[PDB]
Ligand binder design. Structure first.
Ligand SMILES: Nc1ncnc2c1ncn2[C@@H]1O[C@H](COP(=O)(O)OP(=O)(O)OP(=O)(O)O)[C@@H](O)[C@H]1O
Ligand SMILES: Nc1ncnc2c1ncn2[C@@H]1O[C@H](COP(=O)(O)OP(=O)(O)OP(=O)(O)O)[C@@H](O)[C@H]1O
Ligand SMILES: Nc1ncnc2c1ncn2[C@@H]1O[C@H](COP(=O)(O)OP(=O)(O)OP(=O)(O)O)[C@@H](O)[C@H]1O
Ligand SMILES: Nc1ncnc2c1ncn2[C@@H]1O[C@H](COP(=O)(O)O)[C@@H](O)[C@H]1O
Ligand SMILES: Nc1ncnc2c1ncn2[C@@H]1O[C@H](COP(=O)(O)O)[C@@H](O)[C@H]1O
Ligand SMILES: Nc1ncnc2c1ncn2[C@@H]1O[C@H](COP(=O)(O)O)[C@@H](O)[C@H]1O
Ligand SMILES: [Cl-]
Ligand SMILES: [Cl-]
Ligand SMILES: [Cl-]
Ligand SMILES: [Mg+2]
Ligand SMILES: [Mg+2]
Ligand SMILES: [Mg+2]
Lengths: 202, 202, 202
């Protein structure tokens, strides 16, 4: 079970370069006439959380009580699909910038649980990956975002292993591909090209 | 989808110290006024198996034909939730001492398959972990339990890797957290404190 | 939820020796009077794809657009169960020669997604394994099949790790066992005996 448009969920650990690679994919897509609608799942959760006076910062969402995060995750998924449905026809691709596994105050939490996959029905779960050392250096240089709680090189390495396993488990629900995209240091454009090529085979 | 009470499923390989850490969590919980109802999933399966004359020993359950184990697993999950429902209100936590993966006579068998998760609806799957060598030494010193079939250090190591993967797959169904709890040699009380802290963020 | 017959899904990477080990299991089964019905999931997909003029070669199926592969996978699973239902009673075992993870043109693709498991309801997912080096040498010596796209020793190693994780995730849906069967060089008959022994405990 599939939407009329294609759905690509882009995951990977905080700081790996998802939002960067997606911004490169946007330029490449419009150059080649491929129709995208691009959203950030976290921005949809932040919108609701800010309205409820729960947080002001996207990096505090994962510190909320988990039953509250569950409600924000459910509502974000439904709003994303309603918006995608108005923006895209059968020739379009929904790109969702998100996480397969979130490091919360009560443990590793699936970003693509069954209730979310029942809304998104992904054609593909892309996993953006780099070395733990590369990810830790990208986190250090990016002072716009708080990622110290991910636990530097050792925390990144563990989250990456658990996140790969979550991506595969989530793929079983709607027979999503799992596409591993290497985001090599200084080569975000090349990651975006490899991702586009896989998207064209969906 | 959630019960009115919180549900914490405590997994880890045989001999790792689940039942020990849960006994420490019970003391700490009652000291801090946190309401628990604590069950052992295997004890619920043993009750039915003994009534049917199938086994007399909890360590022989995993040697039954798998269609029989499937029936005992289904009934144990339903009985646990019926009992929890009478014991707990919205301020309580159900603690289920169990396994994400059981080493049976027909291979590794999920302890938290979808039919079980549809009953338990876990807020959290805690994974109690130690080194394979620590687990093998704990099994050797505990002569109350038969665990030789788990396969000592090498068998424990493999089951641990497969069990981590099963815990994450099971977490996708109801967006359960996966909380890794280190049960360090001689520090079961500290594992119980780390678990309690995560439980309070559910 | 179970068929009246037992269902064993036999997975492992291309070239590992699934079809070989199953041919040995067939001889051993008929020698011991164990009733099997044996199918190849890919042959069911090839039948439909050839009728539609899509491919002529079983090794090109994984190069089709993924929405097309999804339709062929759904139809293959339904046809297999309809045929098994006419061939087997409650004393029989359906053996399905297939894959937990297929390396496609749009990434790693689950062979046992939920829509497939809802048809097959496996008692067991057997994982046939060997060293990546053994698998790469078996692929080189077998010129009847195209497997260069799996990526030799390094590609085999990665697919094997991801395929193990997919097998476990797929096992959660219907509480299937996961039985790891070592297909050691020159000992396909012994792998078939170990598999038969596990099958008899279902
Ligand atoms: N291939 C690359 N090489 C070098 N720097 C990169 C690369 N890709 C991204 N970066 C940088 O890494 C930092 C993190 O990138 P980005 O914000 O896109 O990560 P993210 O995965 O979206 O993280 P979050 O999940 O926290 O939103 C940024 O400063 C970005 O410019
Ligand atoms: N942190 C610890 N350090 C040392 N010994 C421990 C620790 N935790 C538990 N033990 C001991 O390890 C042995 C196994 O513990 P326990 O029976 O609680 O394991 P379990 O995980 O419940 O096993 P099963 O799954 O077989 O029931 C016991 O003798 C127990 O006292
Ligand atoms: N244990 C073994 N030792 C040596 N060679 C083996 C062994 N098992 C299988 N082979 C050989 O390995 C090659 C691949 O075997 P086979 O075709 O059965 O693999 P497969 O897993 O069914 O692959 P595919 O998934 O591509 O169909 C064949 O030439 C086969 O004879
Ligand atoms: N699929 C998801 N499920 C749950 N929480 C999510 C998901 N995607 C994003 N988030 C949350 O949103 C925050 C901000 O998103 P991001 O900008 O991608 O880091 C993350 O740190 C998470 O707390
Ligand atoms: N969730 C479960 N699913 C299936 N079998 C279980 C489960 N939990 C416990 N068991 C069985 O019960 C036995 C005794 O439980 P324990 O005392 O935790 O070792 C285990 O060895 C298993 O055979
Ligand atoms: N369960 C499955 N799901 C999807 N594709 C499959 C499945 N089983 C087999 N295939 C496809 O069928 C081809 C031929 O099967 P095989 O002969 O086992 O290699 C594989 O290379 C795949 O492209
Ligand atoms: Cl992720
Ligand atoms: Cl476990
Ligand atoms: Cl496979
Ligand atoms: Mg981002
Ligand atoms: Mg115990
Ligand atoms: Mg074959």
């Amino acid at each position: 079970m599939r939407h009329p448009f294609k759905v690509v969920v882009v995951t990977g650990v905080p700081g790996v370069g998802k939002t960067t690679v997606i911004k490169e994919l946007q330029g490449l897509a419009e150059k080649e006439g491929v129709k995208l609608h691009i959203v950030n799942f976290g921005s949809f959760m932040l919108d609701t959380a800010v309205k409820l006076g729960l947080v002001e910062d996207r990096d505090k969402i994962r510190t909320l009580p988990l039953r509250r995060q569950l409600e924000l995750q459910r509502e974000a998924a439904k709003r994303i699909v309603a918006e995608a449905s108005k923006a895209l026809g059968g020739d379009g691709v929904l790109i969702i910038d998100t996480h397969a596994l979130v490091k919360t105050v009560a443990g590793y939490w699936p970003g693509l649980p069954k209730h979310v996959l029942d809304e998104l029905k992904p054609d593909m779960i892309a996993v953006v990956e780099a070395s733990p050392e590369e990810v830790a250096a990208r986190q250090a240089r990016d002072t716009t975002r708080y990622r110290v709680d991910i636990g530097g090189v050792e925390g990144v390495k563990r989250l990456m292993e658990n996140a790969r396993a979550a991506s595969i488990a989530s793929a079983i629900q709607y027979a999503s591909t799992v596409a591993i995209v290497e985001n090599r240091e200084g080569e975000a454009a090349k990651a975006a090209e490899e991702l586009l090529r896989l998207i064209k085979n969906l």
